[PDB]
Design a protein around this motif. Structure first.
Motif, short mmCIF file in Angstrom:
data_model
loop_
_atom_site.label_atom_id
_atom_site.label_comp_id
_atom_site.label_asym_id
_atom_site.label_seq_id
_atom_site.Cartn_x
_atom_site.Cartn_y
_atom_site.Cartn_z
N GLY A 193 0.77 -1.22 0.00
CA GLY A 193 0.00 0.00 0.00
C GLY A 193 0.81 1.28 0.00
N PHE A 194 2.10 1.22 0.28
CA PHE A 194 2.87 2.45 0.32
C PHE A 194 4.10 2.35 -0.59
CE2 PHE A 194 6.08 0.81 3.29
CZ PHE A 194 5.38 -0.19 3.93
N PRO A 195 4.65 3.48 -1.03
CA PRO A 195 5.51 3.50 -2.23
C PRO A 195 6.81 2.72 -2.15
CG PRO A 195 5.59 5.58 -1.07
CD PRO A 195 4.40 4.86 -0.56
N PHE A 197 9.62 3.82 -0.85
CA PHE A 197 10.71 4.76 -1.03
C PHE A 197 11.56 4.81 0.23
CE2 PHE A 197 8.38 7.02 -4.55
CZ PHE A 197 9.38 6.87 -5.47
N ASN A 198 12.73 5.44 0.12
CA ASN A 198 13.56 5.65 1.30
C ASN A 198 12.84 6.49 2.34
OD1 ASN A 198 15.80 5.09 -0.92
ND2 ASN A 198 16.77 4.82 1.08
N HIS A 199 11.90 7.34 1.91
CA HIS A 199 11.15 8.18 2.83
C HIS A 199 10.39 7.36 3.85
CE1 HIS A 199 11.94 10.45 -0.80
NE2 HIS A 199 11.70 11.58 -0.16
N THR A 200 9.80 6.24 3.42
CA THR A 200 9.08 5.37 4.35
C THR A 200 10.00 4.69 5.34
OG1 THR A 200 9.20 3.49 2.84
CG2 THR A 200 7.34 4.98 2.59
N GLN A 201 11.30 4.63 5.05
CA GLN A 201 12.30 3.94 5.87
C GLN A 201 11.99 2.46 6.03
OE1 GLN A 201 14.17 6.43 9.03
NE2 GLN A 201 12.17 7.46 9.08
N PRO A 203 9.17 0.26 6.91
CA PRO A 203 8.70 -0.26 8.18
C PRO A 203 8.44 -1.75 8.09
CG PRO A 203 6.92 0.82 7.05
CD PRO A 203 8.16 1.11 6.26
N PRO A 204 8.34 -2.44 9.22
CA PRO A 204 8.01 -3.87 9.18
C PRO A 204 6.57 -4.10 8.75
CG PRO A 204 9.05 -3.25 11.26
CD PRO A 204 8.62 -1.99 10.59
N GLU A 349 1.67 3.74 -6.31
CA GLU A 349 1.55 4.04 -4.89
C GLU A 349 2.31 5.30 -4.52
OE1 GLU A 349 2.84 0.39 -3.21
OE2 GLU A 349 0.94 -0.63 -3.59
N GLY A 350 3.46 5.53 -5.15
CA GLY A 350 4.24 6.71 -4.83
C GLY A 350 3.57 8.00 -5.26
N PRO A 573 -7.39 1.17 1.28
CA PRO A 573 -6.51 0.98 0.11
C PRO A 573 -5.21 0.27 0.45
CG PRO A 573 -7.33 3.23 0.23
CD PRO A 573 -7.63 2.60 1.54
N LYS A 574 -4.86 0.19 1.73
CA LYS A 574 -3.65 -0.53 2.13
C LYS A 574 -3.92 -2.03 2.24
CE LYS A 574 0.13 -0.17 5.44
NZ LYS A 574 0.01 -1.55 5.98
#
Ligand SMILES: *[C@@H]1O[C@H](CO)[C@@H](O[C@@H]2O[C@H](CO)[C@@H](O)[C@H](O)[C@H]2NC(C)=O)[C@H](O)[C@H]1NC(C)=O
Ligand SMILES: *[C@@H]1O[C@H](CO)[C@@H](O[C@@H]2O[C@H](CO)[C@@H](O)[C@H](O)[C@H]2NC(C)=O)[C@H](O)[C@H]1NC(C)=O
Ligand SMILES: *[C@@H]1O[C@H](CO)[C@@H](O[C@@H]2O[C@H](CO)[C@@H](O)[C@H](O)[C@H]2NC(C)=O)[C@H](O)[C@H]1NC(C)=O
Ligand SMILES: *[C@@H]1O[C@H](CO)[C@@H](O[C@@H]2O[C@H](CO)[C@@H](O)[C@H](O)[C@H]2NC(C)=O)[C@H](O)[C@H]1NC(C)=O
Ligand SMILES: *[C@@H]1O[C@H](CO)[C@@H](O)[C@H](O)[C@H]1NC(C)=O
Ligand SMILES: *[C@@H]1O[C@H](CO)[C@@H](O)[C@H](O)[C@H]1NC(C)=O
Ligand SMILES: [Mg+2]
Ligand SMILES: [Mg+2]
Ligand SMILES: [Mg+2]
Ligand SMILES: [Mg+2]
Lengths: 639, 639
Positions: A193-195, A197-201, A203-204, A349-350, A573-574
């Motif tokens: 559900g999420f892009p 990217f490095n921005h998200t770091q 997550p688990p 997603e991004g 949406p996730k």
DNA sequence: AAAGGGGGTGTTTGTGCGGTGTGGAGTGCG
DNA sequence: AAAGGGGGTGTTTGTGCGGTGTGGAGTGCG
């Protein structure tokens, strides 16, 4: 407009007549670009080549997109399928497969081996031997690997073995190993559900579509070796080989060892844009997968060649022939498509907020030339009229006849599936998507193997240049007619047939619906209201002056919201990425509602009363809200 | 433009100077319209009166909206609070309350009674006696009843008693009974997320915000009777009465009997529209609650009078003064607002697709005249510049000074709360919303009681006509400046301060974030990118020609998407209706992220590592995606 | 005290500024 | 067989058409 549809179609045809698609495919199948696994050095080399070509075409802007995704690769330790005795002792090794199924759980499972036909739900339901605590062996095809694994796992099977049978895959050599992925979804399965990217770091997180059982692809020789240790005889309803067998002997077991390891890789999406002259902020996206496990001539070479040649021709027409697109054209070269359209889904997603109601059509060039007998289309209904008009114009590559031969082609269009890169665009983003191919009556046998070379493609499809020219012609006419006209050429009236079909399917359970305290009058009214909204919109289009850019912008925005309004506004949406109530996946879709109601009809006990009531409410109001939004202003709604 | 801002402001002022707000409020407080509970006959009579007034004003279109919602009402059996001995024997009856808390669970609970100050989380945390298996008594105010009940329930309290203390509510008589609702949300609690129309057929559904413990409002005399049976002495930090006590004696218990019953009622939303002359499909919604438990002079009479007078004045200016709105104006008369803005929320849920990016501002007139000392604003940051400009123009009703006296007013604006009808518009629909009031330093004492009559309002606020005129002036200037200008007057640059504040708050936990393998560079980059996007948009606005309707439409659409892009695209709109990451409710919001990180700082053990990592990822990408969408085309994004 | 850290402001977005010991725009203290 | 039901088509949206026993546009049978 200096150039009209006829002149511009002639320009496209004469550009195509001087284009070398065969040379481009042969170049893309050079040793500098194959094998081309996602995130490898060859994949990056081809991405740089595509970027330099887009820059050479003098497109308006060329830009890159880096994602860091997690994919599964073979370990140093080899995956193995082994026949073992009742006590677990070694009998004899079957095969150390050269291929693998990405996102298969790395585990060792031992037990009975039983045969399901294709892994479809009907195959499992109509199977005499219960598939629980046992490894199921299925034939490749008719559904994605992920669907097979999910069906087997829902019945508590401990493992899945996949092979290509002789009948459906007439490959000469039986030792051929092939590749697939078992993720029941698209994108990076570890960033659902999420892009990613490095921005998200990072997550688990973990997608629910990941299997929890080992999955392995085995060669036909290995499958025949396994069948040599089996007893049951396959039914004649399964049009399979005579060597195929049903159930392992009671004194033998199969040990499946899978040890695939996750790897994080960098994937590049290469983009080029031809900015429009009237409404540049709206664009058509033309995409093609670049990566491939093997040589990938038909998997990714043909699509990438078509993308490059289309970009070249359209840049030439805009720069030299005077073609002035009203909208923009984005040429996207996806990566990691073999792992479930990872690049395309992570891009969607991004940039979901940026693509929202801006991208109004996605054209998929993956596996467009896959044969020559048939022309097959899987697309959103909004594109049916455009596809029909294109078919009536484009001649067949081999026969001189036009592609439009069957008047009832629209009723035979297959729904887009997870294996298609257009599916994320349609089901998740709500962007109308089209996928077409020139194919035979049977699946391409070398698709996804190490024999998917250019030599095999040119041997199976002589005059491949003309078939690729026809595919590029239909794609270019799609782009031209979606981009040059003052109207979007999206047919909102084609969803009237979809709603009628849904109502007809639901009318089969009127007795069941009446047994509950429910009624179908609200869905009937929703269908009629949607038709009335489409008729109102067509009347508005007819009344509006074409030269008036403002009112036509308003009407085109109303048209662009049509597909988005069919995404379910009630699911996450996730957790449920494919929110489209027609083409998505999940309990929010109309087919899921019909499946639940059919479960009630069969009196199996698996029917969920509350779930069905919520499904009926939400589906009814999704359709009614789509109708209301299409009708016009909020005060103009009848009730 | 024949009429500019100065002439049109003068026209509005001279329309206001000849308007009788006091007469309208007095008429709305006639016996034909009070008491005015939701779904009653008086509520329907006032809805018909409002509809006939809108038709008399010759608005462009007047239409109705019927919803069937479930509300709680008092049973024939009386709710009772009873002091009982240790063995459950009757000691003496405390009170059979005349008021009740809607959506309180109908149950009988017996146990110890302990005093929390206001029911806030700080009050419960800093409380010596553990509130579990015991009934908590809290003072009304400082938070909604639903928040008090949720806080008590999260600590396993079996019941809640609510009363209005003498200090905070200086009401002369102590026998006064008041009303509230304990639903932690908005709309119909039994149709969460969907419109509650007949089309849904009302499936079995239940909002998570419904309490599971009895809740009752008691008079001050009953509370003093209960305190007569208590022992502990309240801390001086609670600026409450000297009669207040902390904990029940060990030999006494309180039996709380609540028997409220659900009732399904029909609520009407009455609408009128003044269609715009340039962009009619975009509109400002001006709303006011119509229903009220008691007479509701300040609860609903003032707001409805303001709505009617604003509609009359704007129709007069459009029809007689030559005012030509570019956008439309919708005047909405909500019903069932006392049960948590049920009418407004059900309208938003019903027409979400139709209101999406069409309604760009909601103005709330509920309780706008509530006093005269202070002018208080709670609104979206997009409206801060418009509010500041209006304050610098509108004079104070009593003092001749302008409303704009404090330069730092924007940093003291309270967040919109569940009790405000603008909260569903902002947090759920992503429509910028503004709520303003002329209030004193203390809460209105009669608000929500049977003494909320027009006589009390005119006694507490002499020259109520001038204060209502000032409220209608600020609302009318809001409408004019949001609707007449070629620009929307929405300040996207005001969210730079919000992002800076969020970054400053998050910088307090840099050590905790560094202890984990995380970094804040992505959020810093997101803040900078959002600022750069806003600066780019302002430069585009300055460069664009005002008379060019197309480019200004594009820029205004970019502005209209700003608030929508802050709704979380990763949570279910059904389970988490308030998706706004700034002003919503749930773990998806930035305040929830800060609360989780603070839990980590306190080392309480309630910190969730995985939840925080997901929160950080999703918040970072929500802000980055908002910045990217505001920047422009997808190819123009820096990375 | 002296060399390097975390914590710090808040428009010129600024996320920097760690080396100097206060200062970019604003600004501490071991 | 006869009076009333569920199941039925598919553009003129049609959700109707239950009373007549096939037929609105298309169309069965107890
Ligand atoms: C974004 O994240 C990726 C990993 O998710 C980073 O790439 C890794 O960087 C480390 C250290 O430089 C290397 O040891 C790994 O081999 C890299 N992985 C891959 C797949 O290349 C990347 O550096 C991050 N980017 C930024 C700007 O922080
Ligand atoms: C039928 O579906 C409903 C959902 O519509 C299921 O109820 C949910 O159950 C889960 C726990 O399993 C809860 O977390 C949800 O809050 C429930 N939702 C609702 C609306 O009740 C129900 O369990 C399903 N029934 C069966 C037998 O599976
Ligand atoms: C929509 O639903 C409501 C109830 O949810 C219906 O109103 C009820 O109708 C029944 C039968 O006519 C009455 O006995 C109830 O008293 C009604 N309830 C209320 C609150 O009025 C309503 O008839 C439905 N509308 C339609 C068109 O079916
Ligand atoms: C911390 O939050 C995570 C969610 O981010 C919780 O994990 C979820 O647990 C529920 C069951 O309680 C599952 O249905 C979800 O699939 C889980 N989600 C994820 C992302 O793991 C976790 O339980 C929370 N921890 C605590 C102690 O409450
Ligand atoms: C499958 O389920 C049946 C029924 O419970 C059980 O008897 C059987 O042992 C299961 N299969 C295996 C391999 O255990
Ligand atoms: C509250 O919790 C404590 C700790 O478990 C327990 O001892 C006490 O009995 C609880 N309160 C009641 C009223 O049971
Ligand atoms: Mg630092
Ligand atoms: Mg300075
Ligand atoms: Mg019927
Ligand atoms: Mg007929």
């Amino acid at each position: 407009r200096r150039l009209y549809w006829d002149d511009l179609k002639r320009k496209l045809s004469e550009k195509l007549d001087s284009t070398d698609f065969t040379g481009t495919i042969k170049l893309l199948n050079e040793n500098s670009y194959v094998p081309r696994e996602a995130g490898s050095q060859k994949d990056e080399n081809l991405a740089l080549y595509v970027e330099n070509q887009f820059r050479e075409f003098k497109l308006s802007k060329v830009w890159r997109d880096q994602h860091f995704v997690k994919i599964q690769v073979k370990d140093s330790a080899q995956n193995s399928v082994i026949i073992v005795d009742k006590n677990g002792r070694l009998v004899y090794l079957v095969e150390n497969p050269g291929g693998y199924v990405a996102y298969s759980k790395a585990a060792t499972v031992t037990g009975k081996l039983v045969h399901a036909n294709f892994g479809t739900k009907k195959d499992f339901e109509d199977l005499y031997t219960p598939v629980n605590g046992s490894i199921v062996i299925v034939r490749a095809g008719k559904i994605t690997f992920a669907e097979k694994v999910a069906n087997a796992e829902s019945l508590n099977a401990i493992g899945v073995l996949i092979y290509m049978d002789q009948t459906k895959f007439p490959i000469v050599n039986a030792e051929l190993s092939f590749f697939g992925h078992a993720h029941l979804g698209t994108g990076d399965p570890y960033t659902p559900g999420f892009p990613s990217f490095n921005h998200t770091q990072f997550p688990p997180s973990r997608s629910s579509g990941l299997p929890n059982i080992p999955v392995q692809t085995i060669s036909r020789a290995a499958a025949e070796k396994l069948f040599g240790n089996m007893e049951g005889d396959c039914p004649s309803d399964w049009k399979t080989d005579s060597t195929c067998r049903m159930v392992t002997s009671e004194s033998k077991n199969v040990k499946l060892t899978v040890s695939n390891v996750l790897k994080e890789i960098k994937i590049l999406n290469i983009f080029g844009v031809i900015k429009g002259f009237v409404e540049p902020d709206h664009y058509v996206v033309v995409g093609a997968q670049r990566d491939a496990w093997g040589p990938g001539a038909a998997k990714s070479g043909v699509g990438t060649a078509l993308l490059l040649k289309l970009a070249q021709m359209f840049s030439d027409m805009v720069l030299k022939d005077g073609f002035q697109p009203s909208r923009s054209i984005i040429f996207a070269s996806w990566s990691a498509g073999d792992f479930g359209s990872v690049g395309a889904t992570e891009w969607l997603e991004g940039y979901l907020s940026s693509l929202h109601l801006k991208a109004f059509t996605y054209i998929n060039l993956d596996k467009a030339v896959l044969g020559t007998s048939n022309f097959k289309v899987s697309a959103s209904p909004l594109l049916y009229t455009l596809i029909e008009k294109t078919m009536q114009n484009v001649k067949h590559p081999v026969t001189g006849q036009f592609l439009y031969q069957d008047s009832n082609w629209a009723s035979k269009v297959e729904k887009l599936t997870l294996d298609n890169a257009a599916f994320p665009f349609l089901a998740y983003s709500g962007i109308p998507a089209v996928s077409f191919c020139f194919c035979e009556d049977t699946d391409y046998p070398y698709l996804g193997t190490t024999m998917d070379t250019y030599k095999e493609l040119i041997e199976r499809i002589p005059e491949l240049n003309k078939v690729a020219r026809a595919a590029a012609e239909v794609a270019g006419q799609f782009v031209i007619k979606l981009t040059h006209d003052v109207e979007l050429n999206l047919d909102y009236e084609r969803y009237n047939s979809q709603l009628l079909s849904f109502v007809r399917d639901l009318n089969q359970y009127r007795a069941d619906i009446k047994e509950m305290g429910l009624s179908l009058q609200w869905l009937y009214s929703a269908r009629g209201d949607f038709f009335r909204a489409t008729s109102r919109l067509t009347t508005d289009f007819g009344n509006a002056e074409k030269t008036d850019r403002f009112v036509m912008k308003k009407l085109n925005d109303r048209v662009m919201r049509v597909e988005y309004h069919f995404l379910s506004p009630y699911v996450s949406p996730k957790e449920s990425p494919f929110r489209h109530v027609f083409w998505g996946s999940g309990s929010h879709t109309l087919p899921a509602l019909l499946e639940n109601l059919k479960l009630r009809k069969q009196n199996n006990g698996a029917f969920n009363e509350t779930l069905f009531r919520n499904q009926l409410a939400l589906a009814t109001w999704t359709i009614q809200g789509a109708a209301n939004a299409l009708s016009g202003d909020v005060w103009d709604i009848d009730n």
